[PDB]
């Protein structure tokens, strides 16, 4: 009846539904003045209303953004206030008419940017998957180092055995200290990242600038790190062939070119 209602000249009762999902956690909002139950999901009513600006599909990712307006107290947007969540918040938009149990999917995407122009409002800019095609695609260089992030699909190195679970001893503005890591050689954890559970099955990740003794340096500060929460810390690969094989014994998968050639052409001037 959704299509029939759209074609109807007197039963038009538009209502737009938004679904923000991050793994196992979902946030449901509706633009009407009362909650709507759809597919066993109830959508909350935001005091003040939630509205968008329209959907544009012109083939230009930079121009085809989707804008959401909502109060500054919106739960899903509140997360971005202090620090952007590590994972992207997928957004799905449905369209349905009051009194009908059928809805149609209109827009699908993820959060691109969030800002709070006024205390009584917040503007969210949503981007589609098409915008991820503007970055280069070379991803190849003939250099000495590995040119591969430890654990990627190219290194084929399993980090689960190297996982270390610990409770930090003391947390400071920029340094998190723990005695368990003090037993490892300096720089063992350099290049690794720290992941811990925020809510449900979602974890927030932070990279490590440097590891020295019992003190760990966290890039961008330690804000948001629970002082007593359980933390998982993985090591980091420098990328050198000696580092790759002595520590991880992954030399066969070494993607770097240590000593094949640095400059030698076959159309130079004098070989000697």
């Amino acid at each position: 009846s959704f299509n029939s209602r759209e074609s109807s000249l007197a039963d038009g009762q538009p209502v737009r539904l938004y679904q923000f999902s991050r793994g196992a956690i979902r946030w449901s909002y509706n633009s009407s003045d009362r909650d709507i139950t759809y597919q066993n999901q109830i959508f909350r009513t935001v005091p003040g209303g939630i509205t968008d600006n329209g959907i544009i599909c012109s083939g230009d990712p930079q121009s085809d953004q989707f804008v959401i307006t909502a109060p500054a107290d919106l739960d899903v947007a509140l997360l971005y206030k202090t620090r952007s969540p590590s994972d992207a918040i997928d957004l799905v938009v449905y369209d349905m008419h009051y009194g009908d149990a059928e809805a149609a999917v209109s827009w699908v995407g993820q959060i691109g940017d969030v800002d709070w122009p006024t205390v009584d409002s917040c503007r969210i800019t949503c981007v589609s998957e098409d915008e991820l095609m503007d970055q280069p695609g070379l991803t190849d260089t003939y250099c000495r180092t590995c040119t591969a992030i430890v654990g990627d699909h190219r290194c084929k190195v399993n980090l689960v055995p190297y996982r270390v679970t610990l409770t930090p001893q003391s947390v400071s503005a920029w340094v998190i200290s723990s005695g368990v890591v003090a037993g490892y050689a300096d720089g063992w954890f350099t290049g690794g990242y720290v992941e811990w559970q925020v809510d449900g099955d979602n974890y927030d990740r932070r990279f490590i600038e440097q590891h020295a003794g019992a003190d760990l340096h966290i890039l961008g500060g330690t804000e948001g790190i629970p002082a007593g929460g359980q933390l998982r810390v993985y090591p980091g690969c420098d990328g050198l062939a000696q580092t790759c094989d002595d520590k991880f014994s992954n030399l066969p998968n070494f993607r770097g070119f240590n000593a094949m050639q640095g400059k030698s052409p076959f159309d130079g001037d004098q070989v000697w």
């Binding site: 971005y80 994972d87 990627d152 720290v194 990328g239």
Partner: protein
Amino acid sequence: VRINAPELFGGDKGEGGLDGTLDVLFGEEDQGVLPRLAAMLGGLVPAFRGVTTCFYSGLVTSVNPYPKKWEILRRGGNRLWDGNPWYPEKQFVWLADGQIKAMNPAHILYLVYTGRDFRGLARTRMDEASWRAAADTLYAEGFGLCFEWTRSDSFKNFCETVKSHIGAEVYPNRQTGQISIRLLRDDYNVADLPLFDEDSGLLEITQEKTGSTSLAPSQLIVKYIDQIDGAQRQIIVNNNAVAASQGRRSSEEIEFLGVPTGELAGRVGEREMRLKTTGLKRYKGVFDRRARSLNPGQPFLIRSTPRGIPETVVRVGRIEDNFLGDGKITLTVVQDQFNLPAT
């Protein structure tokens, strides 16, 4: 100079070599005319003052009449400054056991601004204290660079490249009128920095710019030139935390050809990675006259309880003030996340 290499290319059995006598005229203020050059060339031979010139005479090649192209390495920086060097105690930075005689970027900018051969601005127009402090800090950090001029572009482009390399802002001070330089470093005390509040001189804050984290790169490629041989070299900077979250690999290439050593390139690349993946918060605040004395690059604190923003350190950006008429002083600020690690 006695260059002795008659058999460099195998001698007679090969292609020859390099054997001869090399005379160098750097072009001092009092440089005289070389009798040999004028006698050989003849005619009206000037002193060739103000420019470095060389005079080679001897064997160049053999067997074949096709001489080969040459490559000459040359250091510089002291013979510049006309006749009066500025703060010479910190003009040069030594790297790699003295192999590389890098120059302080602050000296480069000072020469460009005040150089008689480049812009010829009066030395009195530059705030000596700020420039001296910047030079001292750079020398302490051992942050030197090497450059060559062949683009023939505007001063603005080269100055922007230098600023991006070092991470500094050059602005004409509104109050005293001299050129001031500020470095983007975490070298500030929280207490002494001014604080701005709704009741302390803040009118309205409109823009929030929450930003995003799922985007932004996970791997960064930095390309630099090694001055020992002049061969292109690169280093790789990785963000494991962001990389794990990213579904697919992403990479960008940045060229820092001014960097002469890989360690320095990595030091700046870590700063760039931290800046680009830490998720800066940008604010567009509106202030009253209490923010009159601020200048570009000056950090200060802002607090606004109704907005739920705690005391935050931000760095000034674009400035637009209206002293007469509307009375609106509007500033654009960014969160303070600029720092150059020494390791």
